[PDB]
């Protein structure tokens, strides 16, 4: 054994919240948490937060609880509390700009870092609020915090979204559309990745056969198909999904630069609700798919 005093402590108290081989994965989960050469990314805290609660046992996932403190939107605590509910067991803070975790009491760590979805705009910052969602069982993005270089900051709530899900919820039964906006959603985003990485590297000859093998294996690893002629029109995408709740309020600015802005407001939302749907990064998988592209790229020269 060469766990930490905290560790064998945390362990030992939380280790039959876990069956057969789901222990030894809860294990290392925790190790990559607290104890590796450092510190997680708040996204990847709360993915790891997740794969506890679903590595354990129904009768002990009541005890991984998420909520936002008096319901203060700005902030938001994930915790995996005791059987008589008797203190806290760990605890994860995630605030505006910072977040920081306690292993039975203990502060592990406090981490600082740039939440900015529009970090290719300067002179413009924006953020992501966030509450727990039942119906994704994840975090998804609540409201949408704007803060412009002459008018006070816009708090424009985006919990309009988790309807679209619940409305969906007694219908054609979502579960049907799940399938549909993953093979769609990422298939573009393996699309942009190869256009992408094309255009910067014009002065090399990436042949459009090269283009699509990339595509085609990438889809491939990735297991989804492509079936999209048509889209049965009767299926709204998480795109248009929070396009719509976007303009639902009276946000509407006229300075200029929205083409490019709104634009990728949308994107990072999306990505963000993607990625509380189906527990996927939309942003790594168009990062391997450009990195397909350049690797069969450099096969093909020889």
Same mark, same amino acid.
């Not at 799940?178 to 990485?197: C, D, P, R, V």
């Given at each position: 054994?060469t ?9 030992e ?10 222990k030894a !994965?809860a294990d290392?989960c925790l190790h ?6 450092? #510190?997680?990314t708040?996204? =990847?805290?709360? /993915? %790891?937060?997740?794969?506890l609660?679903?590595?354990?046992c129904?009768?002990?996932?009541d ?7 008096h319901?203060n ?13 008797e203190?806290?067991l ?14 039975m009491?203990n502060?592990?760590?406090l981490? !600082?870092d ?6 290719s705009?300067?002179?413009?910052? #924006?953020?992501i609020?966030? =509450?727990?969602? /039942? %119906? ?5 993005p609540?409201?949408?915090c ?6 006070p ?13 619940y ?8 579960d049907?559309?799940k399938?549909q ?9 393996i ?8 255009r910067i ?8 056969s090269t283009?699509?093998n990339?595509?085609?294996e990438?889809?491939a690893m990735?297991?989804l198909?492509?079936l ?8 709204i995408p998480?795109?248009?999904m929070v396009?719509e ?10 300075p200029?630069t ?7 407001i949308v ?17 790594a998988?168009?990062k391997m798919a450009?990195?397909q ?7 093909s020269?020889?």
């Amino acid at each position: 054994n060469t766990k930490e005093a905290w560790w064998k402590v945390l362990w030992e108290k939380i280790k039959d919240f876990f069956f057969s081989t789901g222990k030894a !994965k809860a294990d290392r989960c925790l190790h990559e948490m607290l104890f590796a050469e450092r #510190a997680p990314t708040r996204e =990847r805290l709360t /993915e %790891i937060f997740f794969e506890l609660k679903e590595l354990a046992c129904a009768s002990q996932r009541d005890r991984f609880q998420v909520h936002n403190p008096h319901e203060n939107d700005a902030t938001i605590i994930l915790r995996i509390m005791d059987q008589n509910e008797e203190n806290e067991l760990l605890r994860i803070t995630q605030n505006t700009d910072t977040f920081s975790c306690e292993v039975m009491g203990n502060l592990y760590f406090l981490m !600082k870092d740039r939440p900015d979805i529009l970090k290719s705009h300067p002179q413009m910052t #924006a953020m992501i609020k966030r =509450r727990y969602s /039942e %119906i994704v069982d994840y975090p998804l993005p609540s409201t949408l915090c704007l803060n412009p270089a002459g008018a006070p900051i816009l708090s424009v709530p985006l919990d309009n979204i988790e309807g679209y899900l619940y409305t969906e919820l007694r219908k054609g039964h979502l579960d049907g559309w799940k399938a549909q906006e993953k093979a769609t959603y990422l298939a573009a985003k393996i699309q942009s990745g190869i256009e992408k990485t094309t255009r910067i590297l014009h002065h090399a000859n990436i042949s459009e056969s090269t283009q699509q093998n990339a595509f085609l294996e990438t889809m491939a690893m990735c297991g989804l198909k492509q079936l999209e002629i048509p889209p049965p029109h009767t299926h709204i995408p998480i795109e248009k999904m929070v396009k719509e709740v976007l303009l639902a309020d009276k946000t509407f600015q006229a300075p200029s630069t929205s083409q490019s802005m709104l634009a990728e407001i949308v994107e990072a939302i999306s990505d963000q609700v993607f990625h509380a749907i189906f527990r996927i990064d939309p942003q790594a998988i168009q990062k391997m798919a450009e990195e397909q592209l350049t690797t069969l790229h450099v096969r093909s020269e020889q």
